[PDB]
């Protein structure tokens, strides 16, 4: 997009370093490639490489497409040992998001700290006239243009080009993460009615660049999160070393009315206070936690309390966030072994976390209450790594009403913001920031998982279940002053390619 008519900003040489590593649209060349590749060969090991291009040329720079990948398992925990070069399988409704809506070409190299200077010549982008991709895909044929520095720069002999043709034939299908042993985040959810699935969410540097670049104008939504330290996470972290900006609401909490008025089986739970929760839920947003955390909380509650009454079937849930405060605290680990004999702390990561005060009203199938000796000892103490508890002078308001409108005046808390979603076309980021500044008490949480693999199975899973690989969905969360109970009451549905908590 920056052609030869304005290729010289005349400040210094940061333009080539900016345009090599992908967070931004690229520059187009036609025949002026000798300005780049006389620096490019001299990047490793300016009109000097013309008798020594042919050294460090056997397999070293060629092997760095095998370590190049589409999705990054080292975010935000760098000891992962993977490579993932497979986009997706399925399509979505338009109000949800994934790494499928935006073009897959910003892929890079994340393997090593000493081989940072070896990711050249095969990982960058050229953008001749459109259909912008990397160099390894468009260089698999015999008849190819722009080969002037093959017929002229005589240091490059014709003995290893065919190896580069035959080595990069099929690489779009190889996935190999090994769970024995690493630091891989792994999760379980009921996809069918009985057969659970142990999936595993990962991060896309392409989605990271999309969500990265636009916010430089809008510093009102800036959340700088410096990570592990830029040595081994990957050069996509070296490109924006320090900033790593992400999405947040841009406004604090406010004062609503909970209600203006004054099925059944409504189980009422007030005054849940969660200290030390997880605010960095998605790879890209900073704010309220996931909705799969609330789903996992509710499913763990019913899988506790179905000892006697195995008909409980909470099947849906409404959430009412009464108070939300989010700030920076960090987290101290505990000096685990570095491998040989030395005891010292691991790498330093920066952390957002939150104190959430909220009340739930479940819509079960069991006709009455359970106990008050054994209601409190049936509820988990955990919500997205936090500590989630109820005050013991407040156990009296747990009950089972038989209609919705009588449940609202039995909450002694009285500030609302019930949670629904915004089901309109938001297929990029720009139609989100052009969708936020009207009321700007609005949130962009985690809504579900778009899968990648089939699934299949391989040994060291959670509990023998089947291990798929997935990515997150970055849908929008809005609020209701509160009347129809089906714009509320989220529920988990499976569409054979994704998982989304939907309001029925």
């Amino acid at each position: 997009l920056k052609e030869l008519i304005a290729s010289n900003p005349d400040d210094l040489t940061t333009e080539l370093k900016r345009a090599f590593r992908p967070l931004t649209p690229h520059i187009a060349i036609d025949g002026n490639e000798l300005d780049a590749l006389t620096i490019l060969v001299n990047l490793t090991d300016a009109k000097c490489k013309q008798k020594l291009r042919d050294e460090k040329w056997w397999a070293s720079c060629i092997n760095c497409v095998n370590y190049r990948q589409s999705h990054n398992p080292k975010f935000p925990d760098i000891r992962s040992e993977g490579v993932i070069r497979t986009q997706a399988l399925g399509e979505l409704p338009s109000f949800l998001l994934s790494s499928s809506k935006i073009p897959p070409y910003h892929w890079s190299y994340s393997h090593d700290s000493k081989y940072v200077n070896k990711s050249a010549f095969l990982t960058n982008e050229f953008c001749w006239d459109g259909e912008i991709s990397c160099l390894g895909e468009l260089l698999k044929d015999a008849d190819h243009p722009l080969w002037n520095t093959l017929k002229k720069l005589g240091c490059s002999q014709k003995t290893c080009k065919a190896m580069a043709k035959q080595l990069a034939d099929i690489t779009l299908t190889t996935i190999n993460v090994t769970l024995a042993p690493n630091y891989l985040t792994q999760i379980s959810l009921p996809d069918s009615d009985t057969s659970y699935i142990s999936l595993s969410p990962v991060a896309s540097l392409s989605m990271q660049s999309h969500f990265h670049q636009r916010l430089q104008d809008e510093n009102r939504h800036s959340a700088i999160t410096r990570f592990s330290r830029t040595t081994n996470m990957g050069v996509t972290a070296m490109t924006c070393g320090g900033a790593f900006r992400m999405l947040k609401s841009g406004a604090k909490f406010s004062s609503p009315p909970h209600h203006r008025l004054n099925n059944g089986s409504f189980l009422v739970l007030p005054n849940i206070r969660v200290c030390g929760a997880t605010a960095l839920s998605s790879p890209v947003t900073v704010g309220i936690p996931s909705l799969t955390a609330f789903f996992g909380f509710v499913h763990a509650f019913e899988r506790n309390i179905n000892r006697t009454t195995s008909s409980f079937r909470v099947e849906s849930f409404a959430i009412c966030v009464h108070q939300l405060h989010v700030e920076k605290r960090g987290l101290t680990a505990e000096f685990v072994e570095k491998g040989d004999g030395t005891i010292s702390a691991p790498a330093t990561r920066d952390d957002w976390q939150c104190d959430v005060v909220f009340s739930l009203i479940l819509n079960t199938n069991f006709a009455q209450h359970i106990d008050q000796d054994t209601l409190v000892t049936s509820l988990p103490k955990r919500l997205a790594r936090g500590s989630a508890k109820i005050a013991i002078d407040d156990f009296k308001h747990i009950n089972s009403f038989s209609t919705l409108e009588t449940a609202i005046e039995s909450l002694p808390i009285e500030a609302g913001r019930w949670l629904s979603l915004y089901a309109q076309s938001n297929n990029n980021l720009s139609d989100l920031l052009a969708a936020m500044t009207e009321d700007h008490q609005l949130m962009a949480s985690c809504v579900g998982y778009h899968l990648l693999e089939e699934p299949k199975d391989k040994p060291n899973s959670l509990r023998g279940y089947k291990h798929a690989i997935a990515e997150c969905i970055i849908g929008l969360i809005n609020s209701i002053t509160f009347t129809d109970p089906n714009t509320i009451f989220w529920s988990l549905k499976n569409y054979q390619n994704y998982l989304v908590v939907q309001p029925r």
Binding site: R273, E327, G330, I343, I392
Partner: protein, 337 residues
């Protein structure tokens, strides 16, 4: 013995924040606030005047002060005292593995915990956990330089009164001092029933009064982040204000500060795999000394059969028993790599 490829235990104690309130002599409660403050210090470092052993720094360049910026919190003028409210919940998740890749170490370690709690009761670990809630070790340095402080708690499940300790610097010095009040016995035994039974629970809500001097300073916890703002505080939003909290993983380290059985054993430590200290930093029970957790867990096969006989040595075996039990209460991810 060999540990499996994955192995982890969920934790068994989980506390909350310690939110501060100030009370006025007409008995009304308001949250406590703080402010930033910039301040003129001196050139006092050693890198400013030395390089390795020699000097780089003139006598009028050491005499020019420098600005910093701190947060600052104190007790407002004309107040009675400070209230501090807190919650904790003892449960039973020290007996079920959360994740295991095998069946032999599963049955081995569950029969280890049943043989333990049959032959040696839970009275030592519960009377160690409980007298860190009843003297206020969850108030680092706030208890120092104060006139007096008092603790009350409401247990659950309970019928009767609120349990109350008063004037803890004076008369609750030691073990017998806790042991001979009215109802130490019921609150110890309910922790014991929480640990012993499957899927049980025992909750306590604690609140303290702290009686500080005039415009005394309050010392909450600080943030972890690698211009000039040193001393940032961790805050919350409480009923319209932004107030200091004193930690959420910090108070758990106050409760679990019980490790006293290590090869020199001067003062109690926070429990962990390696015996890490941080003031006068070093790691005794080093993993080459054979007394870390990953050695006792390997010797647990021997420790199965030694709790089938009659007389334990009571020094070198039950201290390993208490240490292994305390780390099972603490938490897991024992994946050896």
């Amino acid at each position: 013995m060999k540990l499996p490829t994955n192995l982890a235990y969920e934790r068994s104690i989980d506390p909350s924040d310690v939110c501060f309130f100030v009370v006025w002599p007409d008995d009304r409660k308001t949250p406590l606030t703080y402010n930033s403050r910039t301040l003129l210090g001196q050139m006092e470092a050693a890198s400013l005047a030395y390089d390795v052993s020699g000097q780089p720094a003139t006598a009028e360049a050491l005499a020019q002060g420098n600005p910093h910026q701190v947060d600052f919190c104190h007790v407002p003028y004309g107040a009675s005292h400070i209230e501090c409210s807190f919650s904790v919940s003892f449960s039973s998740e020290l007996r079920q593995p959360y994740k295991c890749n095998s069946s032999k170490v599963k049955q081995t370690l569950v029969q280890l915990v049943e043989l333990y709690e049959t032959k040696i009761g839970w009275t030592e670990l519960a009377t160690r956990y409980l007298m860190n809630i009843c003297n206020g070790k969850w108030l680092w340095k706030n208890t120092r330089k104060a006139y007096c402080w008092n603790i009350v708690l409401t247990p659950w499940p309970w019928n009767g009164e609120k349990v109350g300790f008063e004037d803890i610097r004076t008369n609750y010095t030691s073990r017998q001092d806790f042991k001979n009040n009215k109802n130490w016995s019921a609150i110890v035994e309910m922790i014991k029933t929480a640990f012993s039974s499957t899927d049980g629970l025992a909750i306590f809500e604690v609140r303290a009064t702290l009686h500080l001097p005039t415009n005394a300073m309050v010392r909450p916890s600080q943030v972890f982040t690698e211009t000039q703002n040193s001393r940032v505080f961790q805050s919350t939003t409480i009923d319209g204000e932004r107030s200091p909290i004193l930690g959420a993983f910090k108070t758990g380290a106050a409760i679990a500060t019980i490790d006293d059985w290590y090869p020199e054993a001067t003062e109690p430590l926070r429990v962990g795999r390696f015996g890490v200290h941080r003031e006068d930093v070093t790691c005794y029970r080093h993993p080459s000394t054979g007394k870390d957790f990953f050695s006792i867990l390997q010797q647990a096969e021997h420790y199965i059969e030694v709790l089938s006989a009659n007389k334990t040595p009571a020094q070198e075996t039950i201290n390993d028993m208490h240490f292994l039990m305390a780390n099972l209460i603490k938490g897991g991810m024992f994946q050896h790599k």
